Structure 1
């Protein structure tokens, strides 16, 4: 059960960092999208 715990914490933390990386990209691309759409 300790072996399952470390796998669960690492999978959760890796997912959280990837989700934050995508969220910053979405904010960047949607800002470009509305400017490009206006032009």
Structure 2
């Protein structure tokens, strides 16, 4: 019974650990999407400010 409930407990720990490491990559990749679009709009606004710097 010792080995039994021990493996059962640690298997539940593993299943929850998976239930979180799954969306680990999810909230990782949304961050990167944010980085990308933010750098994009950074470039856009840096071009626009310079174009308006004329006079």
TM tier, smaller = 0.7 to 0.9
**TM-score w.r.t. length of structure 1:** 0.82
Q: What are the ranges of 5 or more consecutive residues in structure 1 without an aligned counterpart?
A: none
Runs of 4+ in 1 over 6 A off after TM superposition: none
Aligned length: 39
Question: What RMSD, in angstroms, separates the aligned Cα atoms of the two structures?
Answer: 1.0
Q: What are the ranges of 5 or more consecutive residues in structure 2 without an aligned counterpart?
A: 1-16
Structure possessing the higher radius of gyration over alpha carbons: 2
